[PDB]
Design a protein around this ligand. Structure first.
Ligand SMILES: CCCCCCCCCCCCCCCCC[C@@H](O)O[C@H](CO[C@H](O)CCCCCCCCCCCCCCC)COP(=O)(O)OCC[N+](C)(C)C
Ligand SMILES: CCCCCCCC/C=C\CCCCCCCC(=O)O[C@H](COC(=O)CCCCCCC/C=C/CCCCCCCC)COP(=O)(O)OCCN
Lengths: 70, 83
């Protein structure tokens, strides 16, 4: 009676644990991957991250400048 | 109406210098936006050649660009002579 009215079967807890373990394992591997990706982008600068501004080339004036040699 | 004229008349007495200064400053602020010769001053400034006019390499597609200074096309300064 106690088992019937207060508790559930073992399969429920077993499969809930399986799902929880999957979630945590993927989170751990994602954390490692993100750390490595951040390190690579900060070192190489070719990624979307750690992009530091440079001078906009639309500011340059391309006209004759009173002297032939610029 | 009456109050403003009374104020201006009271200022023109015992304070004529301030009245004159404010009138002259307001005229300086207002008149240039109404004068027709301000655009003439702008045109005169744009017509003063400080730099060498660098020629364009011709490609056969500029009817409006002269080949010689004597050629009719190009900006003219007859209006400036007229002034
Ligand atoms: C001879 C008898 C021998 C056995 C004695 C049994 C004693 C029972 C009282 C002790 C209870 C222990 C604590 C249990 C708390 C948790 C129970 C909880 O899990 O059950 C919930 C229900 O909780 C109960 O309603 C709590 C009962 C609280 C009262 C206990 C008895 C004493 C109450 C005294 C009140 C006095 C008031 C003043 C009177 C004047 C519903 O659970 P649920 O999450 O759906 O479960 C899903 C699985 N299902 C679907 C199979 C169920
Ligand atoms: C919007 C244009 C502005 C630019 C033009 C002005 C350039 C320079 C003028 C401004 C300089 C600063 C002015 C500071 C004003 C001080 C006023 C003041 O408090 O002094 C009064 C003196 O004068 C006054 O009463 C206050 C101002 C009264 C009104 C003055 C003229 C207001 C506008 C008049 C002209 C309006 C527009 C022109 C129309 C003219 C008519 C054709 C008190 O005298 P005290 O020295 O303190 O002596 C105390 C003991 N008696």
């Amino acid at each position: 009676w106690i088992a019937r009215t207060f508790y559930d079967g073992p399969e429920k807890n077993y499969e809930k644990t399986m799902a929880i373990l999957q979630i945590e394992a993927e989170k751990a591997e994602l954390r490692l991957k993100e750390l490595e990706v951040r390190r690579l982008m900060r070192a190489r600068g070719d990624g979307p991250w750690y992009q530091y501004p440079t001078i906009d080339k639309a500011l340059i004036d391309h006209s004759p400048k009173t002297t032939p040699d610029n | 109406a009456g109050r403003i004229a009374s104020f201006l008349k009271n200022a023109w007495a015992k304070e004529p210098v301030l009245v004159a200064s404010f009138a002259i400053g307001g005229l300086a602020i207002i008149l240039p936006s109404l004068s027709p010769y301000t655009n003439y001053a702008i045109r005169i400034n744009r017509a003063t050649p400080y730099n060498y006019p660098v020629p364009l390499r011709d490609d056969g597609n500029m009817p409006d660009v002269p080949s010689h200074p004597q050629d009719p096309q190009g900006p003219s300064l007859e209006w400036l002579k007229n002034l």
